[PDB]
Amino acid sequence: GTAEIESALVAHPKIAEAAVVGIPHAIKGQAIYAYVTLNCGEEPSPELYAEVRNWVRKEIGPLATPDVLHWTDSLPKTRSGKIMRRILRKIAAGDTSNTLADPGVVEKLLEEKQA
Amino acid sequence: YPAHWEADVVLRDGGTARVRPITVDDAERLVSFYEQVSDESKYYRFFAPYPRLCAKDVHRFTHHDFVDRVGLAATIGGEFIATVRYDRIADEAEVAFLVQDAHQGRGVASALLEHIAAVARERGIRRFAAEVLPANNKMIKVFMDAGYTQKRSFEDGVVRLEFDL
């Protein structure tokens, strides 16, 4: 499940936070879409990508390897700090025609996804 | 803060815990407390794995204006065993609590919810809202018993509970 994959991702030394959603993929059956926040001082790179995926592949298994790693500083959270998973699902799925602490995070997530 | 916001509360076993505002001096206590919370309870509190608090979180969870944001701790022998807080969204505020797993079922969660409501009523909050993961039935029951009602639920199964103050 998603919690297992998130836990494995957070376990990575360079990963601070993670939230994973499953979304229908027409080619793949289901795609594992992972939003990931690196720790302070860490920065995304073409090779950190493969390292993280290899990490998950070893920790959990190839079936749990994320299809997309979406690096972000911008996990959407309620003011008490709860992850707004429903917003993450909508953005990953392109279902974006419609308690959130910082509204500005949505625009940043949408930009990062198109990149 | 008002002196009556600090008070001894009676637990179900007949003993007491101290309920008090969380202060700027409580960073170390908060961190030690969080070490004793299970991975499962952390997940239920933040909706994702969150094994240790980032510095900005330790700061925000110990620095409050006590109008728009309030945080209270329950303590035994000076140690945090639970926290509760509200964040103004308006005269509505989001509420969250967290109890060390070993101290569940002692009446701590129920006392903290009563106390945070009492503070909110003094600061012009008209309603509490809480989001809870649907499988977290221990937490849902605490809120139910405190008089919260289910308002709606979302695509991710998350339930929105509300309480008119």
CATH code (residue B80): 3.40.630.30
Q: How many domains does chain B have?
A: 1
Q: For chain B, say whether A81 makes contact (Cβ under 8 Å).
A: yes
Query: Determination technique for this PDB entry?
Result: X-ray
Extract the runs of DSSP E, i.e. beta strands, from A1-115: 15-24, 30-38, 68-71
Q: For chain B, say whether A114 makes contact (Cβ under 8 Å).
A: no
Annotated resolution, angstroms: 1.9
Interface contact B158-A86, CB threshold 8 A: yes
Write the CATH number for A73. Answer: 3.30.300.30
Which of A112, A111, A102 lies closest to A34, judged by CA? Answer: A112
Q: What span, in angstroms and rounded, lies between the C-alpha atoms of B113 and B19?
A: 11
Q: How many domains does chain A have?
A: 1
At A20, list the tokens. Answer: 């994973």
Adjacent-strand bridge partners of B129: B94, B162
**B-proximal residues of A, 22-51, CB under 8 Å:** none
Sign of CA dihedral A115, B48, B87, B94: positive
Q: Under DSSP, is residue B133 helix (H, G, I), strand (E, B) or coil?
A: coil
CA distances to A64, A102, B164 from B152, rounded to whole Å, are 32, 22, 15
Residue A71, domain extent: 1-115
Distance in Å, alpha carbon of A114 to nearest chain B alpha carbon: 23
Interface contact A86-B47, CB threshold 8 A: no
Residue B32, domain extent: 1-165
Contact between A36 and A69 (Cβ < 8 Å) = yes
Q: What span, in angstroms and rounded, lies between the C-alpha atoms of B111 and B17?
A: 10
Q: What span, in angstroms and rounded, lies between the C-alpha atoms of B61 and B81?
A: 15
